Amino acid sequence: SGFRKMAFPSGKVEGCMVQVTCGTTTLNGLWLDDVVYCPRHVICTSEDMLNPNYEDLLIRKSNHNFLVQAGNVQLRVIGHSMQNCVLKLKVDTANPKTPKYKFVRIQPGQTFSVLACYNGSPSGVYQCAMRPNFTIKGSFLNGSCGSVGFNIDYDCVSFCYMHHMELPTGVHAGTDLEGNFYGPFVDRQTAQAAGTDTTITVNVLAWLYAAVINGDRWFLNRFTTTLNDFNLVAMKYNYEPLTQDHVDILGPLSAQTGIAVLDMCASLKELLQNGMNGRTILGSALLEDEFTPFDVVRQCSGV
Amino acid sequence: SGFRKMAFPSGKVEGCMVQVTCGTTTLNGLWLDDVVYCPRHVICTSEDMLNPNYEDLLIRKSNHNFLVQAGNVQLRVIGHSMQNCVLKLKVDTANPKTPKYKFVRIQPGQTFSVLACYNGSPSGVYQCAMRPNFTIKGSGSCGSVGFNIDYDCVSFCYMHHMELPTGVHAGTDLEGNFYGPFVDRQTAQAAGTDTTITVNVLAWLYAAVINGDRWFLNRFTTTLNDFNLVAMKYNYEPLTQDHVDILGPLSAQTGIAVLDMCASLKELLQNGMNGRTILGSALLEDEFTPFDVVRQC
Numbered sequence: 178s179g180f181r182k183m184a185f186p187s188g189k190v191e192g193c194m195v196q197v198t199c200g201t202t203t204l205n206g207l208w209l210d211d212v213v214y215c216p217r218h219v220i221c222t223s224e225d226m227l228n229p230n231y232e233d234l235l236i237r238k239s240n241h242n243f244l245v246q247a248g249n250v251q252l253r254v255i256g257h258s259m260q261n262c263v264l265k266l267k268v269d270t271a272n273p274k275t276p277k278y279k280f281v282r283i284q285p286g287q288t289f290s291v292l293a294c295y296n297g298s299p300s301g302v303y304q305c306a307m308r309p310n311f312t313i314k315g316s317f318l319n320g321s322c323g324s325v326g327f328n329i330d331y332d333c334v335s336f337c338y339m340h341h342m343e344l345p346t347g348v349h350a351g352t353d354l355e356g357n358f359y360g361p362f363v364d365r366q367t368a369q370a371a372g373t374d375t376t377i378t379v380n381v382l383a384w385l386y387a388a389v390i391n392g393d394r395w396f397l398n399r400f401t402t403t404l405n406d407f408n409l410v411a412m413k414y415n416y417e418p419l420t421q422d423h424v425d426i427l428g429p430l431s432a433q434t435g436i437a438v439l440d441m442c443a444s445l446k447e448l449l450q451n452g453m454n455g456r457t458i459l460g461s462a463l464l465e466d467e468f469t470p471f472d473v474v475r476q477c478s479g480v
Numbered sequence: 481s482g483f484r485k486m487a488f489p490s491g492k493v494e495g496c497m498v499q500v501t502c503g504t505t506t507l508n509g510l511w512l513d514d515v516v517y518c519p520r521h522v523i524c525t526s527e528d529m530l531n532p533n534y535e536d537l538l539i540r541k542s543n544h545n546f547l548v549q550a551g552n553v554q555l556r557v558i559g560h561s562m563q564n565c566v567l568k569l570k571v572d573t574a575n576p577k578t579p580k581y582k583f584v585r586i587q588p589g590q591t592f593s594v595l596a597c598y599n600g601s602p603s604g605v606y607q608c609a610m611r612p613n614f615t616i617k618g619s620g621s622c623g624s625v626g627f628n629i630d631y632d633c634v635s636f637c638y639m640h641h642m643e644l645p646t647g648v649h650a651g652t653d654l655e656g657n658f659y660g661p662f663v664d665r666q667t668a669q670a671a672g673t674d675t676t677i678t679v680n681v682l683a684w685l686y687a688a689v690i691n692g693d694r695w696f697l698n699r700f701t702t703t704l705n706d707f708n709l710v711a712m713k714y715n716y717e718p719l720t721q722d723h724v725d726i727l728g729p730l731s732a733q734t735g736i737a738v739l740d741m742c743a744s745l746k747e748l749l750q751n752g753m754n755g756r757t758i759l760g761s762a763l764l765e766d767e768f769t770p771f772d773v774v775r776q777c
């Protein structure tokens with residue numbers, strides 16, 4: 178009963194967080210097996226930030242120029258390598274707390290948990306979505322770079338996000354764990370445009386299904402709609418187009434509530450065109466798009 | 481920057497969660513030192529739920545009637561005791577993962593993180609407030625615990641026992657005392673009229689200012705009493721001087737008098753937000769304490 182925006186249990190990731198210092202810059206790194214991963218801008222000074230040449234900057238660094246601390250333990254750096262926008266520090270000790278893990282790149286609209294850390298130490302954990310424009314609206318103070326986002330299958334941690342920077346708009350941008358940025362962003366201190374953001378339609382629909390599961394049925398109409406009529410409305414209201422793939426993954430929720438996806442779309446259409454008139458759904462006067470269909474099913478019997 | 485409803489890192493609590501089975505009822509337990517804590521209704525059968533006599537029910541149980549499994553291993557129960565509404569199952573093995581910990585009873589309006597578990601295993605973690613009526617709007621789960629973390633010490637403040645017929649959740653501290661007027665019986669039970677946690681809304685408005693959302697601010701002022709008259713009308717907790725005092729550090733960092741923020745909240749209550757949002761929400765948010773805002777900002 179009830180419905181919460183829940184994050185993954187963070188213990189498997191807490192045991193991987195280390196502190197990485199180079200020059201005067203300190204940030205968070207991810208220690209898995211015998212490799213520590215961190216944003217490459219750890220090698221930049223305040224005078225490099227405008228247009229750094231990372232290859233030239235890295236060439237002036239040696240293994241002993243990187244201090245990696247795991248709790249009260251210094252790790253010995255026995256090698257360094259740059260892969261896209263992340264730095265990989267080879268250390269002489271494998272992490273005894275290495276969970277089973279994968280590196281994954283996620284699609285826009287997918288969700289993950291973020292373990293916000295500061296100089297190697299966890300501060301908190303929260304659940305968020307990769308925006309359609311490849312940014313995230315997180316909580317990252319100065320010193321948070323290197324904090325990672327993740328999902329957990331059962332005992333396996335799929336790392337999907339590493340935080341690099343806050344854009345001038347206040348939203349956050351980062352890479353997968355191979356150093357490839359989500360979206361058009363580069364790790365330089367220049368103004369950079371994020372694309373026009375949209376609402377994740379399939380997530381709103383999943384969350385309306387969650388509302389029905391919890392008794393909030395007031396928004397349900399028996400009006401119906403075609404997929405393409407709905408998408409015309411979605412475009413007007415800056416919602417992501419709804420595809421058959423989205424309809425397919427909403428299947429299990431359609432079955433449980435006995436509500437055809439297109440009937441739920443017609444009810445969402447009414448919400449988009451008429452508003453909520455001061456009523457709420459699952460305690461919100463706004464339409465929530467940070468629950469995937471999987472998240473909703475998962476909360477209804479998880480672990 | 482940015483502002484999220486963040487939960488505490490849950491690792492120190494994950495290592496304390498075990499599975500407790502008695503009869504045919506299985507639920508979550510908390511394993512600290514050589515004691516496993518769990519709701520006492522684990523000893524009830526489906527025929528006892530309506531009006532159990534827990535002393536009589538426990539008297540018919542022995543140590544071998546409690547199955548405590550920590551991951552892949554059974555723990556040996558070498559004694560049992562009932563303290564108010566929780567069982568303490570003495571075991572022959574101290575939890576090697578016991579964090580530094582305290583048991584704390586919290587006040588209404590204070591916040592904590594919940595590690596929602598099912599039959600001993602974590603499902604997720606979320607941040608919530610103890611409602612003024614002592615219920616919790618949260619999400620096999622009985623025995624999951626709520627907690628705060630100071631630095632390396634876990635203050636356990638909550639254990640989940642039951643869902644009320646309204647769907648809200650109720651539970652105890654770790655000495656087994658219920659928050660609120662509730663009893664661990666399967667009967668209809670009223671929770672009091674809930675109110676909004678005023679001092680938390682004010683803290684969150686400070687967080688909004690810190691993150692750039694200043695649009696609700698005015699130089700219109702108010703007394704503590706003029707404000708509280710408004711607060712009562714909109715089902716808001718009355719604002720005390722203690723509340724004004726703990727909002728001090730936020731007032732000092734932002735340059736906004738507490739009463740100025742109160743007057744700004746007064747206008748929000750009387751006029752609504754008129755379709756505008758604060759920190760991405762169209763409703764006034766009351767699950768951040770002044771401390772929560774300060775530690776996150």
Ligand SMILES: O=c1c(O)c(-c2cc(O)c(O)c(O)c2)oc2cc(O)ccc12
Binds near residue numbers: 202204319366367
């Ligand atoms: O937004 C940025 C940022 O937060 C940091 C950062 C993060 C940390 O955690 C640190 O410790 C630190 O020194 C710097 O570096 C950047 C470098 C760029 O080239 C562009 C943008 C950023």
Ligand SMILES: O=c1c(O)c(-c2cc(O)c(O)c(O)c2)oc2cc(O)ccc12
Binds near residue numbers: 642644
């Ligand atoms: O709401 C209640 C509830 O959820 C459970 C419960 C929880 C679990 O996690 C279990 O595994 C389990 O068997 C039972 O027991 C109750 C017992 C009462 O006397 C009154 C209310 C509840």
